[PDB]
Structure 1
Amino acid sequence: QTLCDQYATYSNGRYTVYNNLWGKSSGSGSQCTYVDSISNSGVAWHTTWTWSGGDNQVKSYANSQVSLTKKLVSQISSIPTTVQWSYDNTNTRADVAYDLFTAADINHVTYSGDYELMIWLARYGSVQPIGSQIDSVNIGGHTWELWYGGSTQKTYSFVSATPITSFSGDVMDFWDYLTSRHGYPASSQYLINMQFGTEPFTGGPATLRVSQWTASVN
């Protein structure tokens, strides 16, 4: 499908793709998302955007999403994921990131949570995560900046200083890290959403091509 409207979506079984221009009112621009291939083994998609204004506000988060059974984080065995992606124009202010939400209420809305976990595989330009940097950490064979902030929604962001365009990992390593070292309440939080996509601030035109994304919550 071709997805140019603000909340356009396409789903086929296990994976869903969204245009998700939730922050378009913060600036001026436009964005279209496209599904290239979709199956039980993974999804390929791309999104093209130009954005200006509201320099420190995210304009959108076009993304692919994996279907999951909502489970306590303490009961999840593994969250394997692999992704291959590229940007054609990197002279932008944007990130490429996983986004996960957890909540104590299993029926919480899925686009927010008690906690948000972001894993930024790339940071372009003068943009920064929510909150402030609290440390540099080593997880899964990579060094990450760890950021924390937010009020009603507590957001932890793990940021790679160098773009990782071919990534494989287990997101449970990041939940384990927060559980062990930052008191994250894994035994009372349900994982309710897992997504991968890009947050534009300003720039463009730029096309994120995701040649394959796979994920599973086990």
Structure 2
Amino acid sequence: AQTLCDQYATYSNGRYTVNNNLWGKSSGSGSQCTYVDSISNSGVAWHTTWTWSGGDNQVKSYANSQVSLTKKLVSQISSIPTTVQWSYDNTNTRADVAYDLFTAADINHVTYSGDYELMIWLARYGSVQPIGSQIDSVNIGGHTWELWYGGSTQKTYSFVSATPITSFSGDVMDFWDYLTSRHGYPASSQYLINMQFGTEPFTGGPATLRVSQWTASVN
């Protein structure tokens, strides 16, 4: 496609969307550009480049790819298969690489937040930590995850890999099933309303996240 350097620059082919999404710009100084490298109904390749300083513990952006979905109750979803291959050239930073999903009881809730948020951090760089506190450790889909929980009006579970997973194939229903069966997650009254993959920088740079393939589907 082309070039996404504006704060909320965005490109979409229908099924996949790529977003620069510099929502946390004010918390510091720096700049960030995102690019669509290839896109089709079989997946999307993209990259984003950034430098950020200040606000050491605020997130500056979440450049991301996003998949269109039909909004369903989590209890009625059969699978959310996803695969991704990515790399960072500069890992001397304070950032994460993560999936981000939102659910809400109101099917028409705004799709950039919700009653619940599920994050799956494939990589944690430097002195950064998820929302809330670590409440558990669990093996899901063949990887060991720190499980973090916190938040007030929006409750956020974060599964965190202590070692970066640059090649990932999974089913996000594995994570919803675990929260449903062991942490009381109300799957039967929550609608899944958004699914994204991308990177949250805190500080560092310049660095580039190169996503050579992201695929996702909500079934």
Please report the TM-score for the alignment, with normalisation by the length of structure 1. Answer: 1.00
CA drift at 1:177: 0.2
SS in 2 for 1:21: coil
SS in 2 for 1:54: coil
SS in 1 for 2:31: strand
CA drift at 1:124: 0.2
CA drift at 1:70: 0.2
SS in 2 for 1:89: coil
Distance of 1:121 and 1:163 partners within structure 2: 6
Aligned length: 218
CA drift at 1:117: 0.1
Please give the per-residue CA displacement for 1:114-151, whole angstroms capped at 9, x wherever unaligned: 00000000000000000000011110100000000000
CA drift at 1:85: 0.1
SS in 2 for 1:210: strand
CA drift at 1:13: 1.7
Please give the per-residue CA displacement for 1:144-196, whole angstroms capped at 9, x wherever unaligned: 00000000000000000000000000000000000000000000000000000
Q: CA RMSD in A?
A: 0.3
Distance of 2:6 and 2:154 partners within structure 1: 27
Distance of 1:30 and 1:75 partners within structure 2: 41
Residue 113 of structure 1: aligned partner: 114
Distance of 1:27 and 1:116 partners within structure 2: 25
**Are 2:10 and 1:9 equivalent residues in the alignment?**
yes
Distance of 1:112 and 1:156 partners within structure 2: 13
**Structure 1 spans left out of the alignment, 5+ residues:** none
Identity across the alignment (%)? 100
Please give the per-residue CA displacement for 1:48-80, whole angstroms capped at 9, x wherever unaligned: 000000000000000000000000000101000
Distance of 1:185 and 1:142 partners within structure 2: 24
CA drift at 1:206: 0.1
**Structure 2 spans left out of the alignment, 5+ residues:** none
Residue 163 of structure 1: aligned partner: 164
Distance of 1:121 and 1:70 partners within structure 2: 25
Residue 23 of structure 1: aligned partner: 24
Residue 42 of structure 2: aligned partner: 41
